[PDB]
Amino acid sequence: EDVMKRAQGLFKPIPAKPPVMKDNPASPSRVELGRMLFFDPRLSASHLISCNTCHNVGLGGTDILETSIGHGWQKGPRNSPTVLNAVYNIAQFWDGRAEDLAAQAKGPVQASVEMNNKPENLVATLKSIPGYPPLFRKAFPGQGDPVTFDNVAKAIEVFEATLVTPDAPFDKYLKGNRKAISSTAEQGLALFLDKGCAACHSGVNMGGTGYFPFGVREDPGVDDTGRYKVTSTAADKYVFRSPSLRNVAITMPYFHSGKVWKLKDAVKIMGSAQLGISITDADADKIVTFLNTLTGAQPKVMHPVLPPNSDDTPRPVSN
Amino acid sequence: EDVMKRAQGLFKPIPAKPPVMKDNPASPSRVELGRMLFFDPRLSASHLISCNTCHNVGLGGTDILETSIGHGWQKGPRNSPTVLNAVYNIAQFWDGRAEDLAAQAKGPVQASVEMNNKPENLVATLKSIPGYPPLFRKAFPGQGDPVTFDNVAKAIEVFEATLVTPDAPFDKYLKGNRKAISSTAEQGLALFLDKGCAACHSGVNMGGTGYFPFGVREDPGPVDDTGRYKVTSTAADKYVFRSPSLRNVAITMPYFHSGKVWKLKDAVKIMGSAQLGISITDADADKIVTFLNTLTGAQPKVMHPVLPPNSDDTPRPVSN
């Protein structure tokens, strides 16, 4: 229709092929190594936590928990965004001050807070695991000492670029198949476009494109729509990334705080005066039916066989 | 909520103090070196083009030309954005593919294509100028070899952080003085807020916050600029566009990524696009213009540096 046509300008389907990372060429050995590192809990000092713990490829690329602290740029606990299609995000942080956010993008996003704080421990751990240096040599040829914090992030990044979810019903719709989604789905899309949601949640990743001066907070003055609202005040130090809504139906809970569990309530909360939006409960329901067509084909990811410790591998730090 | 209170959520005034750059502490000697480098045309192969050429601190931090190619991440000629407050930009490139744009921010944006392509040459140039190494040693103490590409960009960057324009009438209004802008400028603000302009042109910099799948293109479908150009967004689009900071917009014509639209009132009417869900009347556009005219801040008084002279070793200018 013209609804389809408008949708085809606002969004693009996820390509099936992993996107190319500038200055980070993919090769099977580098993808394979990134997969190992992504699932390797020895990257944490406890030896218990891997990327997959908080960005679980079985659970929509997130952890279905409210918040955690995973990374050095967080000022507090935040909900773990999906790693699925994360390589298509422009804005990669939940929130910050405008003057910081571009510099923060100097990355890497693929380092947890422990790795970023103690990159010497990361390298020493990997060098002490006999099967790693050979993989690093194969994945990063022509370097004398390829086992580096920067190459760890590069290998993860190329593996991460394979964690894309093409072929959601909405994407079949964008490709021109009007029947790929129900007519109620389509009405939800019409509301999404007309009410102005698409402006913030747009492009190939349907979001992750920018930061906005609205964040969902507790209302200071009985139900999630009554308890939380979109807030924007004079005193705001930080702006908020408007997230990609792809796979939103399988990555509850919602918002930077993880505090809203139901996708319907999230949608009602986004029907906010602060945003120029008023939606009825029946509107909210149609928008949800639409948001449920953004679930892509989930990657089937082999759990890696990790190289064993040596006697030299540092011990877990305890309890 | 009345218009001022709504404006106060949507935007914040430009602070008077240079923002702090992470991992790049300002000091007077690093600001001064960055000033020298910003104005030194020996950073270009011709030895005639400095950052100030295309981001001219006397002309709103831009060059008032339609387009140029200054930087390695451009795929084609683009309009030079202002350096004034650019340190408050989050989105720093005009346009690109989503999957490339975050990676590009591992920058530095302070490097022209000539600097970025030929970093040893840049270091060789600076090291051949006997007054530069001592300045790099002052600016970057405790570093045995401080004349490096990364230090040229850090020094520029802290100089650029001082190129902020606090005290626009509109900022005086955000701070609570309703009389700092005219009643017509306030109606243009109301229009700006009500029509949804502010969603994309938001925050301390009034834009530069994100990218959108809309760019101004020549219409293929009657004649003025509003006739000739339009917001376009198609299935075929490879690239999204940055929605720019509107601070100092009255003084940084021409407009959009292509610099094709010269009149701010025309840029405003073009943005009253059905693609964006916006319909504005001609008098609506005039009021919005009146409002945008209030976003001109106090322009930095910048001393032109005395640049250290060439030695006989300094590379020779090249024309191409």
Ligand code: HEC
């Ligand atoms: C192991 C090294 C990894 C990798 C490869 C990633 N992570 Fe996390 N992650 C967590 C939280 C709460 C956030 C949001 C933080 C914030 O911005 O405030 C993140 C963020 C990410 C991203 C960004 C995705 C995007 O573009 O938005 C990516 C790519 C990413 N992570 C990859 C939480 C956790 C953890 C919980 C303890 C752990 C462990 C990790 N992350 C580790 C990793």
Ligand code: HEC
């Ligand atoms: C920009 C001005 C926005 C408009 C208009 C809409 N949304 Fe939004 N959305 C925006 C931000 C900055 C955020 C994050 C807020 C926070 O505190 O975290 C959101 C969040 C959502 C979510 C949550 C998705 C997730 O957690 O993964 C959803 C489901 C959502 N937005 C949907 C939505 C709808 C239906 C809208 C129209 C009614 C709408 N959004 C408008 C920014 C903006």
Ligand code: HEC
């Ligand atoms: C013209 C020939 C230029 C010269 C010389 C320099 N710059 Fe530039 N700059 C130019 C353009 C056309 C653009 C936009 C490019 C794009 O497509 O995105 C830029 C961009 C910048 C920016 C980004 C501003 C922002 O939007 O956040 C900055 C900070 C910048 N340029 C600074 C800069 C410096 C420090 C230079 C000397 C080394 C310099 N530029 C040279 C055009 C030209």
Ligand code: HEC
């Ligand atoms: C996001 C969906 C936007 C809304 C809503 C509005 N604008 Fe915008 N604006 C947007 C982009 C992506 C761009 C760059 C487009 C390009 O090809 O370059 C712009 C550009 C402007 C400009 C030009 C500023 C400059 O070149 O420095 C102006 C003056 C401007 N926009 C004003 C404006 C008004 C008045 C709006 C509501 C009527 C409006 N914009 C909405 C993205 C978005």
Ligand SMILES: [Ca+2]
């Ligand atoms: Ca979530």
Ligand SMILES: [Ca+2]
């Ligand atoms: Ca301009």
